[PDB]
Design an enzyme around this catalytic site. Structure first.
Site, mmCIF file in Angstrom:
data_model
loop_
_atom_site.group_PDB
_atom_site.id
_atom_site.type_symbol
_atom_site.label_atom_id
_atom_site.label_comp_id
_atom_site.label_asym_id
_atom_site.label_seq_id
_atom_site.Cartn_x
_atom_site.Cartn_y
_atom_site.Cartn_z
ATOM 1 N N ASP A 25 0.777 -1.230 0.000
ATOM 2 C CA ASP A 25 0.000 0.000 0.000
ATOM 3 C C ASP A 25 0.814 1.287 0.000
ATOM 4 O O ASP A 25 1.263 1.736 1.054
ATOM 5 C CB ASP A 25 -0.919 -0.049 1.233
ATOM 6 C CG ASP A 25 -1.898 1.097 1.288
ATOM 7 O OD1 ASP A 25 -1.810 2.007 0.446
ATOM 8 O OD2 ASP A 25 -2.761 1.083 2.176
ATOM 9 N N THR A 26 0.970 1.892 -1.184
ATOM 10 C CA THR A 26 1.731 3.125 -1.328
ATOM 11 C C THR A 26 1.090 4.320 -0.631
ATOM 12 O O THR A 26 1.755 5.326 -0.393
ATOM 13 C CB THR A 26 1.948 3.484 -2.811
ATOM 14 O OG1 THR A 26 0.677 3.639 -3.467
ATOM 15 C CG2 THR A 26 2.745 2.383 -3.507
ATOM 16 N N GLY A 27 -0.191 4.206 -0.289
ATOM 17 C CA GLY A 27 -0.876 5.310 0.367
ATOM 18 C C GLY A 27 -0.710 5.286 1.878
ATOM 19 O O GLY A 27 -1.151 6.193 2.575
HETATM 20 C C1 MK1 Z 1 -0.958 3.972 8.310
HETATM 21 C C2 MK1 Z 1 -2.412 3.769 7.784
HETATM 22 C C3 MK1 Z 1 -2.314 2.281 7.363
HETATM 23 C C4 MK1 Z 1 -3.472 3.986 8.999
HETATM 24 N N1 MK1 Z 1 -2.716 4.741 6.604
HETATM 25 C C5 MK1 Z 1 -3.875 4.838 5.918
HETATM 26 O O1 MK1 Z 1 -4.876 4.137 6.164
HETATM 27 C C6 MK1 Z 1 -3.921 5.861 4.783
HETATM 28 C C7 MK1 Z 1 -4.562 7.142 5.339
HETATM 29 N N2 MK1 Z 1 -4.708 8.271 4.376
HETATM 30 C C8 MK1 Z 1 -5.185 9.527 5.028
HETATM 31 C C9 MK1 Z 1 -4.403 10.219 6.222
HETATM 32 C C10 MK1 Z 1 -4.959 10.202 7.534
HETATM 33 C C11 MK1 Z 1 -4.291 10.811 8.635
HETATM 34 C C12 MK1 Z 1 -3.059 11.438 8.427
HETATM 35 N N3 MK1 Z 1 -2.419 11.508 7.145
HETATM 36 C C13 MK1 Z 1 -3.169 10.855 6.040
HETATM 37 C C14 MK1 Z 1 -5.558 7.793 3.236
HETATM 38 C C15 MK1 Z 1 -4.987 6.497 2.595
HETATM 39 N N4 MK1 Z 1 -4.712 5.418 3.595
HETATM 40 C C16 MK1 Z 1 -4.144 4.208 2.955
HETATM 41 C C17 MK1 Z 1 -5.198 3.289 2.366
HETATM 42 O O2 MK1 Z 1 -4.700 2.698 1.161
HETATM 43 C C18 MK1 Z 1 -5.631 2.105 3.249
HETATM 44 C C19 MK1 Z 1 -6.692 1.179 2.663
HETATM 45 C C20 MK1 Z 1 -6.841 0.051 3.706
HETATM 46 C C21 MK1 Z 1 -7.822 -1.012 3.298
HETATM 47 C C22 MK1 Z 1 -7.612 -1.841 2.154
HETATM 48 C C23 MK1 Z 1 -8.580 -2.829 1.810
HETATM 49 C C24 MK1 Z 1 -9.753 -2.985 2.608
HETATM 50 C C25 MK1 Z 1 -9.957 -2.162 3.741
HETATM 51 C C26 MK1 Z 1 -9.000 -1.178 4.089
HETATM 52 C C27 MK1 Z 1 -8.035 1.918 2.417
HETATM 53 O O3 MK1 Z 1 -8.354 2.931 3.031
HETATM 54 N N5 MK1 Z 1 -8.817 1.361 1.499
HETATM 55 C C28 MK1 Z 1 -10.132 1.860 1.070
HETATM 56 C C29 MK1 Z 1 -10.160 3.202 0.291
HETATM 57 C C30 MK1 Z 1 -9.462 4.439 0.352
HETATM 58 C C31 MK1 Z 1 -9.743 5.506 -0.553
HETATM 59 C C32 MK1 Z 1 -10.744 5.382 -1.567
HETATM 60 C C33 MK1 Z 1 -11.501 4.196 -1.721
HETATM 61 C C34 MK1 Z 1 -11.245 3.129 -0.846
HETATM 62 C C35 MK1 Z 1 -11.791 1.745 -0.666
HETATM 63 C C36 MK1 Z 1 -10.751 0.892 0.028
HETATM 64 O O4 MK1 Z 1 -9.735 0.277 -0.767
#
Ligand code: MK1
Lengths: 99, 99
Positions: A25-27
């Site tokens: 996960d690059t995000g």
């Molecule tokens: C360290 C930690 C792991 C808590 N970071 C994150 O969660 C960051 C947060 N920022 C924000 C941040 C928050 C606080 C401080 N700095 C930055 C926004 C982006 N996310 C990363 C996301 O890619 C995480 C995934 C996790 C996931 C994958 C599959 C199933 C459930 C959860 C995520 O959020 N996924 C969902 C997702 C996300 C965006 C759009 C659509 C969708 C659907 C889905 O894939």
């Protein structure tokens, strides 16, 4: 190897002798796992993501095998709907985004 | 472009005539922005992240220029601490993970 993004970027990992699947996960700045047991002390921590914040345990210097690559880093353990390998560990296996 | 992951993988995009930065996020299935205005009909949608769920508007077939590349896809608009470009659009610019 190269991984396209038509499907979730899943990799198998070994951590603390346990086998799990996690998303490259690059995000994510950090790495987090739900329900795995790690030894030693840890520090409470709250991470924010989409939807809110979660209280987790922070374990430092944890050995983790990612798709065959052995590296060591900080790993968080706490509630999450998906195990995620963040940038803190992806830089260690030399992972890059390309287009 | 190849992009390493020592820093957040941010890209500048243009959508609906507005400019903003968004994270290339391999962990996200969808694309979401907070604070943008899009035209037309939309459908309500609950999105799940690391900290819980968020109610958002789903806009289909929305043109978006990502780091210079013009593509079209579904874009969500709702509360989020960071604008995110998910796999649904990264596949359209041919973005891949490599290591
Ligand atoms: C360290 C930690 C792991 C808590 N970071 C994150 O969660 C960051 C947060 N920022 C924000 C941040 C928050 C606080 C401080 N700095 C930055 C926004 C982006 N996310 C990363 C996301 O890619 C995480 C995934 C996790 C996931 C994958 C599959 C199933 C459930 C959860 C995520 O959020 N996924 C969902 C997702 C996300 C965006 C759009 C659509 C969708 C659907 C889905 O894939």
């Amino acid at each position: 190897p190269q991984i396209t993004l038509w499907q979730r970027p899943l990799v198998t990992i070994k951590i603390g002798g346990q086998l799990r699947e996690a998303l490259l996960d690059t995000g994510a700045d950090d790495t987090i796992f739900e329900e795995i047991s790690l030894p030693g002390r840890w520090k409470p921590k709250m991470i924010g993501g989409i939807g809110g914040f979660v209280k987790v345990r922070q374990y430092d210097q944890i050995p983790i095998e990612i798709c065959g690559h052995k590296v060591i880093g900080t790993v968080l353990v706490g509630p999450t709907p998906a195990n995620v390998i963040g940038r803190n560990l992806m830089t260690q296996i030399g992972c890059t985004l390309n287009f």
